[PDB]
Amino acid sequence: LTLPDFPLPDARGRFGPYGGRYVPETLIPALEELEAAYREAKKDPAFLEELDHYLRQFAGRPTPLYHAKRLSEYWGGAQVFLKREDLLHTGAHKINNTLGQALLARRMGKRRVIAETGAGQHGVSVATVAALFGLECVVYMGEEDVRRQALNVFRMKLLGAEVRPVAAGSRTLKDATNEAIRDWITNVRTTFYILGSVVGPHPYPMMVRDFQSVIGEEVKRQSLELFGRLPDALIAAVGGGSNAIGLFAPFAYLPEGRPKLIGVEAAGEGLSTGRHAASIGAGKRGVLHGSYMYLLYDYPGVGPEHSYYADAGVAEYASVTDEEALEGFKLLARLEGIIPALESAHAIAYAAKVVPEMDKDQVVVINLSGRGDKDVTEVMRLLGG
Amino acid sequence: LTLPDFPLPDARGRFGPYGGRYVPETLIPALEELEAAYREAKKDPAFLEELDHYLRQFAGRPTPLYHAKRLSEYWGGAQVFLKREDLLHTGAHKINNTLGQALLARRMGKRRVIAETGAGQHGVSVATVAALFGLECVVYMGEEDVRRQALNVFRMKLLGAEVRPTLKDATNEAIRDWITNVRTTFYILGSVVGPHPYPMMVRDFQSVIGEEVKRQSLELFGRLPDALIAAVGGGSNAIGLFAPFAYLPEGRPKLIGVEAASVSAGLDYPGVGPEHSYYADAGVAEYASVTDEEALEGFKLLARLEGIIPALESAHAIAYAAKVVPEMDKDQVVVINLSGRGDKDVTEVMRLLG
Ligand SMILES: [Cl-]
């Protein structure tokens, strides 16, 4: 493992005009303590060696770059390869970042890690990692969410995490984030706040990317050892997560002929494209979670680095309808025997619109962020065939 | 990346006095052909190549031999390593076997593959490798199981397979179908208690686990483990880990199989199967059991200390290791097999625990 040193973000956490840390003076000291501790850690071979050991032994890295022969033939276009992040522990790509942040918590001396969770996957990713290192864990979760996520709540309790219900406001992720951040600020000396999103204040965006970058670097290597060259295009779902960021960053900052990068977002309800693309075309920008970025003032935003990618021209952003995503979901399962997370099914849907036109000798990599076993019931709610 | 050529069973499928099964006259010709095809397949490099390719790129092999540090410190005894079979695609170790069998069926020119399942784990495994190889898949499930397993039924359906309705009523309905359409159908069985050559075949495809542990132990310890522990029951988990060690001239690790706390349909059979029975007699493996309450405690112990939620089945072995690892020395090594992940039994364990 080698943590990158990309030309961006800059010292202030800026990717061009995007990024930064537009936060209250109460958060500042905590964030600068973190940034400093992270800058040090990424250089230390002791940290790198340890991180690498856990990614391999615990998370199960590196993940295979799987050739979907049936998919390739079905589309009749370029050869399609799947980066199997679904074969990770917890079942999500999230763990690369959670493992990295928890390890930095231990290295900083913190004995406690907190985070917030909506659906519950993050909460489980954090609870899981805290168990590995033996850290006290508290996950803030809106009450609404706590009732429609009994399973994941039980898992967190099994992992030994304390799930702290949030009744405030509308009892959702939004509220949980406030209770959490406040906790972290008060208990900064002993606690670390684990954020898995690429949309947030510096150095979170840079840190999440760096930890997720192990995805693209593996693709870069696996490709060179497989085709003697890099892919023609990389396709991944985008939406305030981190999945695409890890795949993209190792190629975004490369010279002229890097592979084409395609971020696929969910069609904005009442729109023809996603919020990001829509913001790019309209030129509307704003601040979100102390991060300047494209904002159409699913997620309200996709992040500063993705905003930079758009203007730098290293990545284009497309969208697909809810129906096209379900079509992608059913497709992969039927042809490859792999049930992908709904997020990834979106990437599959878009690849359907561009892979067929490409040459049969070209290579395309699609990122499978996680497994769909979590989304099976939601997809089956619309029970049919 | 070749297949194993173990001394047992013999040409007839017997492990000492074990193996003999009562197979109706109309099934004998299908089992003989299966033997012929299989014996011929393991001789072909191209066959071994595809198996390995898929085992690696699709299933995710090799699985890590993980050092459970917090749990080795807790028991205070020997070092504990967990063979992470829970990282495999689908979450179960049984996929080593289904991938191999669906591959055999394709080589044999079959275009259809059938199977039967209770809770649905086997149905999904089969359906998965059926979609992977473009084979037609039909899973026989009982009316009851089908209602209590809405998820798996849907999964199977998404994988493109057809689910047609107690599992007892589904097994002998499938054997019939197999016989009638044997010319075009292959029957995937994930059990080590059926008639020859299934126990040998399943053992061979599962062997990959044990062989991996053998080389992983050698590279990390320079020697083989002191004891290997695995739950013996639903599936072929313990056999895959055991076989590559059970026939070693010596320097053999102690093999400890762990067991759980009427009517025989189709090709099912009571017991642990021919090979585990032979191991016991020959004395190359010893067996034990734990109470439901003890395994339940293991489930929770591994979740809290290692961040790994095991299958209730693996929790039985965990529980058993709890009774022997602490006595041992901190310089000794113990490998525990984690057959699958417990993200399924977690709903059940959630009930009987308030
Ligand atoms: Cl992203």
Query: What domains sit in chain B, N to C, each tagged with a CATH number?
Result: 1-59+94-202 (3.40.50.1100), 60-93+203-354 (3.40.50.1100)
Residue A122 CA to ligand 1 centre (angstroms): 15
Q: How many CB atoms lie within 10 A of CB B144?
A: 15
Q: How far apart are CA A40 and CA A47, in angstroms?
A: 10
Is residue B173 within a helix (H) or strand (E), and if so which, with residue range? helix B168-180
Question: What are the backbone dihedrals phi and psi of residue B88, each rounded to the nearest 5 degrees, phi first?
Answer: -60, 150
Q: Which of A3, A1, A2, A357 is nearest to A207 (CA)?
A: A3
The minimum CA-CA distance between A327 and chain B, rounded to whole Å, is 11
Resolution in A: 2.5
Q: Do the Cβ atoms of B131 and B90 come closer than 8 Å?
A: no
E-strand spans in B72-161?
79-83, 112-117, 136-141
Is residue A336 within a helix (H) or strand (E), and if so which, with residue range? helix A322-336
Taking CB atoms and an 8 Å limit, are A151 and B89 in contact across chains? no
> Is B149 an interface residue toward A (CB < 8 Å)?
no
Q: How far apart are CA B54 and CA A65, in angstroms?
A: 12
Question: Is the Cα dihedral B217, B220, B221, B223 positive or negative?
Answer: positive
- Using the structure block, give the residue that is written with the tokens 């599992």: B167
Experimental approach was X-ray
Q: How far apart are CA B188 and CA B196, in angstroms?
A: 13
Question: What are the backbone dihedrals phi and psi of residue A151, each rounded to the nearest 5 degrees, phi first?
Answer: -55, -65
Question: Encoding tokens for residue B116?
Answer: 């039967």
* Alpha carbon A206 to chain centroid, angstroms: 12
The minimum CA-CA distance between B168 and chain A, rounded to whole Å, is 27
Report helix angle A275-282 to A304-312, nearest 10: 50
Taking CB atoms and an 8 Å limit, are B127 and A57 in contact across chains? no
Q: Do the Cβ atoms of B225 and B217 come closer than 8 Å?
A: yes
Distance set, CA B286 to CA A1, A283, B232, B236 (Å): 42, 71, 11, 17
Q: Are strands A14-15 and A18-19 parallel, antiparallel or unpaired?
A: antiparallel
The C-alpha angle A70, A73, A75, rounded to 5 degrees, equals 110
Question: Encoding tokens for residue A309?
Answer: 């990618």
Distance set, CA A12 to CA A15, B133, B225 (Å): 9, 52, 52
Mutate: best of A70, A158, A335, A375, partner B, most B CBs <10 A: A158
Strand ranges of the sheet holding A162-166, from the earlier edge strand across to the other edge:
A162-166, A136-142, A112-116, A191-193
Q: Do the Cβ atoms of A297 and A31 come closer than 8 Å?
A: no
- Using the structure block, give the residue that is written with the tokens 């601040």: A287
Q: How far apart are CA A233 and CA A250, in angstroms?
A: 13
All residues at 6 or more sequence positions from B58 whose CB lies less than 8 Å from its CB, including other chains:
A64, A66, B89, B99, B132
> Is A84 an interface residue toward B (CB < 8 Å)?
yes
Taking CB atoms and an 8 Å limit, are A333 and B70 in contact across chains? no
E-strand spans in A51-174?
65-67, 79-84, 112-116, 136-142, 162-166
Question: Is the Cα dihedral B174, B176, B177, B183 positive or negative?
Answer: positive
Q: Do the Cβ atoms of B81 and B302 come closer than 8 Å?
A: no
Question: What are the backbone dihedrals phi and psi of residue A63, each rounded to the nearest 5 degrees, phi first?
Answer: -90, 145
Question: Encoding tokens for residue B347?
Answer: 């709903």
Q: Which of B59, B48, B43 is nearest to B103 (CA)?
A: B48
Distance set, CA A67 to CA A246, A319, B102, B162 (Å): 20, 24, 19, 26
Question: Encoding tokens for residue A87?
Answer: 């074969």
Q: Which of A63, A369, A87 is nearest to A221 (CA)?
A: A63
Q: Which residue in chain A has the smallest CA separation from B161?
A: A334
Q: How far apart are CA A122 and CA A125, in angstroms?
A: 5
Q: How far apart are CA B313 and CA B324, in angstroms?
A: 18
Q: Cα(first)–Cα(last) distance of chain A, in Å?
A: 44
Q: How far apart are CA A51 and CA B264, in angstroms?
A: 51
Strand ranges of the sheet holding A291-294, from the earlier edge strand across to the other edge:
A14-15, A18-19, A291-294, A285-288
Asked about B73 being catalytic, the answer comes back as: no
Residues of A in contact with B158 (CB under 8 A): 330, 333-334, 339, 376
Distance set, CA B194 to CA A296, A362, B233, B278 (Å): 62, 47, 13, 15
Cis omega before residue A62 (within 30°)?
A: yes
